Amino acid sequence: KELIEYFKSQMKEDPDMASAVAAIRTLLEFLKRDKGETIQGLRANLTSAIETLCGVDSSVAVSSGGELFLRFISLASLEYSDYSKCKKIMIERGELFLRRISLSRNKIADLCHTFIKDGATILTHAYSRVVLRVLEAAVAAKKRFSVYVTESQPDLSGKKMAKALCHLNVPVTVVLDAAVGYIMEKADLVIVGAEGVVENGGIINKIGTNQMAVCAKAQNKPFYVVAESFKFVRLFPLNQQDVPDKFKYHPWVDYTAPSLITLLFTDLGVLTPSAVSDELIKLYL
Amino acid sequence: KELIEYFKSQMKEDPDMASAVAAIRTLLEFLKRDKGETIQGLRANLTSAIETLCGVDSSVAVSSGGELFLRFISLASLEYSDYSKCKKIMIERGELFLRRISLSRNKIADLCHTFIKDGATILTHAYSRVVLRVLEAAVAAKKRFSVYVTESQPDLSGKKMAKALCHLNVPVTVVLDAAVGYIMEKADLVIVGAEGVVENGGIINKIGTNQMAVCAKAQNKPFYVVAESFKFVRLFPLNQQDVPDKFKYHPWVDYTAPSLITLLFTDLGVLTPSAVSDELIKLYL
Amino acid sequence: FLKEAARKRKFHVIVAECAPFCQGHEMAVNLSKAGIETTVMTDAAIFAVMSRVNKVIIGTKTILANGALRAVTGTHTLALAAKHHSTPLIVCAPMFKLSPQFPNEEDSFHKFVAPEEVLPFTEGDILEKVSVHCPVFDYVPPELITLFISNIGGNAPSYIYRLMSELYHPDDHVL
C-alpha cells in the first residue's frame, strides 16, 4: 500500500524524528486522500490505517499518537456534526497541531536543562533524542558535567548514546547493564526519556529502567523523566504483567510506578507524577 | 616457578573446584617443600607464595583462603612456639582441614535445599557450583520448581548455568541483565552464591547482585545467600567504593549490605547476617 | 491555629527553638499566656522526643510548585523525623505564600546572614581559619508533607500544581 511506504519514507528522511510524530504526519497526509463524505467511513478508514501502522511498528508512542488523532477528530466532530466544513477545519487544526508538536523537543530541553548543575554526574539508561537535546542545551549553557550511560544489552544503543555525547565534548562513560547499582552512589540525578506515560504517572520505558528507578529510590537520588505530550496513553498497569504484550514484543519494555519518579519535563511544562492524570482527564481520550 | 604451575594443575584436573580450595591445597603441598627451620622464614616464604597466587587470580576467595591458612599457622604457632614438632602437627591438622573443607559443599546443599518448596520460582544471577548443588539436591528430593537465571553480560556464564540446570530436567529460563526488575514479582525466593563474606555480613559478588538484592528488598522477596566458610574475609566496605580495587579488577564485583540479606547457608550451619561477625571475632583473623 | 482550639480542647504543645534566631521562645511565651501547657526545647532533642508526639503543625515561608517548602532552618529534620515515625505534618499557610517555581535553582535558595549568630566575633584568631555558614532557611521536599491547611480548606500536596494553575499565568512565571 501507501500507508506503509509513507511511514517508512517519513522515518527515513530524518532518522532523529520519533515514530509517533511520523505516524501523525502520515495520518494527516492520508487524510487528504479521503474521498468518502460520511464520518464513520473516514473514522474506520483512518482507524484501520492507525492499527496497521501500529502493527508495523510495535511501540507505545505510535498507539498514543493514533489515539490522540482520533480524539482530536472526535472533538472536531463535536464541532458541528457536519463533515462538510469539518474536514477542512480539521486539516487546518491538524497542521497547527503538527507545527506545535514539532517544537515540543526544544521546549522540553529549554525547561529541563536548568535542573543540571555544574560538576554534577548524570545517569542515563539508553539513547534518547530528548535527553541528548537536554544535555546539549546544558553544555550550551556554559555548564560542565559527567554522564554515565548503560550499554543497553538488548540492543547496543547505549554505546550510540555515548558516542553522540562524546562528540559534544562531554566526558561520557559507559557502564554495564548489571552495574547500575555500583555507580548509583556516584550519580547526583537521573534523567531518562519515556516511551509512554500511563494514566497514573508511571512510564513505559526500556527493560532496564525500572530497576534503575528502584536503585534511585533506594539511595534518595532524583529520578527525572523527559517525554513529550503525544506519548500520553490511557493505560494503568498494576505490575509488570498488566502491560500489553504487543508493546513488550526477552521483553523490550517495562513499567515504572510514579512513586519512583521525582518530576516530569514535558512540552506542557514541568509537572509532577500526578498532574499527568489531570491532563489525561481533561482530554477525555 | 612451581607455585603457579601447581595452582593451575589443581584448577585443571577438576574445573568444578573453586580457586580458594585449590590455593589452600597448593599452599599445604608447598609446605612439604619447606627446608627452613625458622618460623619467620616459613611465614615469609609462604606469605610470598600466597601474594603471588593472589596476583595470578584476582578473586576474594583466594585471599580469604590465604588469610585463613596464615591464621591457622599462627594458632599452631601458639601451640608451643616450637617449629620442631609444630611443622608435623601443623601438616596433620592441615590435612584434616582440607578433608573437612571438601564436604562443605554437600553440607551447604543438604542444609539449604529444605527452604525450597514445590511449585516455587527461584531467581539466580550467575553460575555457581553451590546453587547448582542446592538445586540438584532439591530436585533429588522429589521437588518441582522453576528457575530464572540472569545472562551475566560481563561474561556469558548465566547461559552456562542455565544449560547445566536444563540438563537436570528443570524448566530453566534466561532473562536479560536489565530485566531483573521485570521478573522480580514472578519469583518466590532468591538464592545466589557469595564470593566473599565481609565483616558485617554483606557479600562480595558479581556486579549484578546488589541491584537484584535491592529489588528483592523493594518487593519483600526472601534473598538467601549460599557460601562456604573459607570465603570469610575481614573487610568492611561502607559503599561500592570502599571495596579494594584489586578484587574489582567495567568492575567485576560489588558489595551487598547485610540489611538486604535474609539468611546465610554455610557449612557451619544456617546463619543470619550478624552471626558471621561473631564467627569472625571468634577466629581473630 | 493553636490558640483558637485551646478554648474548647486541651492539649500539650512542644516548641523547638531555632538555633540562629531563637524565635520559638516568643511563641512559647505567647501560648503559655493563654494556658496551653507549652514546653520549650532545642533542635538536638527533636528526634529524641518525637516518639511520644501525635501531630505536627508548622508554618512555612513559601510553597514551591511541586508541593515543597522553603521553611526556616530545622524543618527538613522535623519532616524527616515525622516520616520516620509516620506522623502527619500539617502546614498552615495562606494562598499568598505560593510561588510558581520548582526547585530549579541552586545555592541561592537559603538566605545566608552574618556568622555572628552562630559563632561570635570574640572567639579569637580561629575566625581566620574556621569557615562558618549560617543558612536561615532550608528546603523540605513534598514527599514528607501530609496536608496543607489554607483559607479555602485543606488539600494534599499532590494538588498544589492545580492551585498554581489557578493562581498564576504560565507566561508570568519568569516575571
Do A129 and A250 belong to one domain?
A: yes
Do B64 and B148 belong to one domain?
A: no
Q: What is the 3-state secondary structure (H, E, C) of A128-191?
A: CHHHHHHHHHHHHCCCCCEEEEECCCCCCCHHHHHHHHHCCCCCEEEECHHHCCCCCCCCCEEE
Q: At what resolution in Å was this solved?
A: 2.8
Sheet holding C137-140: strands in order across?
C62-63, C69-72, C137-140
CATH number, domain at A222?
Answer: 3.40.50.10470
| Closest alpha carbon to B85 in B122, B126, B144, B39 | B39
**Residue contact B207–A254, C-beta within 8 A:** no
Q: Looking at beta carbons, which residues of chain C come within 8 Å of A117?
A: 106
Residue that finishes a domain, picked among B89, B107, B125 = B107
Query: Chains A and B: how many Cβ contacts under 8 Å?
Result: 98
| Closest alpha carbon to B26 in B45, B59, B50 | B50
Task: Report the b/e string of A230-259 with b at 16+ CB within 10 A.
Answer: bbbbebebeebeebeeebbeebbbbbbbbe
CATH number, domain at A103?
Answer: 1.20.120.1070
Residue that finishes a domain, picked among A72, A91, A107 = A107
Sheet holding A254-256: strands in order across?
A196-197, A203-205, A254-256
Do A172 and A55 belong to one domain?
A: no
Do A149 and A199 belong to one domain?
A: yes
> Residue B284: is it exposed, middle or buried by C-beta count within 10 angstroms (0-12/13-18/19+)?
exposed
Cα nearest neighbour of A113 on chain C: C104
Contacts of residue A203, Cβ cutoff 8 Å, sequence gap at least 6: A194, A195, A196, A197, A209, A225, A227, A255, A256, A261
Do B12 and B116 belong to one domain?
A: no
Whole-angstrom Cα Rg for chain A: 20
A78 CB-side CA count, 13 A? 5
Distance from CA of A115 to the nearest CA of B (A): 26
Q: Distance (Å, rounded) from C-alpha C61 to C-alpha B192? A: 51
Domain C1-167 falls in which CATH fold? Rossmann fold (3.40.50)
Do A102 and A193 belong to one domain?
A: no
Q: Which three cell numbers stand for residue B125?
A: 544471577
Q: How many domains does chain A have?
A: 2
Q: Looking at beta carbons, which residues of chain B come within 8 Å of A154?
A: 176, 178
Do A258 and A191 belong to one domain?
A: yes
Amino acid present at C24:
G
Query: Which H or E run contains B224?
Result: strand B223-226
Determine contact, residues A209/A256, Cβ cutoff 8 Å.
yes
**Residue contact C102–A117, C-beta within 8 A:** no
Do A121 and A39 belong to one domain?
A: no
Whole-angstrom Cα Rg for chain B: 20
User: Cα dist. C77→C2, C56, C136, C145 in Å?
Assistant: 22, 13, 14, 12
- Angle made by CA atoms C145, C41, C67, in degrees to the nearest 5: 15
Q: Distance (Å, rounded) from C-alpha B211 to C-alpha A212? A: 8
Do A261 and A141 belong to one domain?
A: yes
Do B255 and B228 belong to one domain?
A: yes
Residues of C with CB under 8 A from a CB of A: 65-67, 102, 104, 106, 142, 158-159, 161-162, 170
A211 interface with B at CB cutoff 8 Å: yes
E-state strands within B32-181: 121-124, 146-150, 172-175
User: Which residues is B256 bridged to in the sheet?
Assistant: B203
Residue that finishes a domain, picked among B107, B137, B167 = B107
Do A103 and A191 belong to one domain?
A: no
Contacts of residue A48, Cβ cutoff 8 Å, sequence gap at least 6: none
Do A125 and A259 belong to one domain?
A: yes
Determine contact, residues B151/B177, Cβ cutoff 8 Å.
yes
Structural domain harbouring B87: 2-107
Q: For residue A271, give the nearest of C106, C142, C161 by CB distance.
A: C161
Determine contact, residues B119/B144, Cβ cutoff 8 Å.
yes
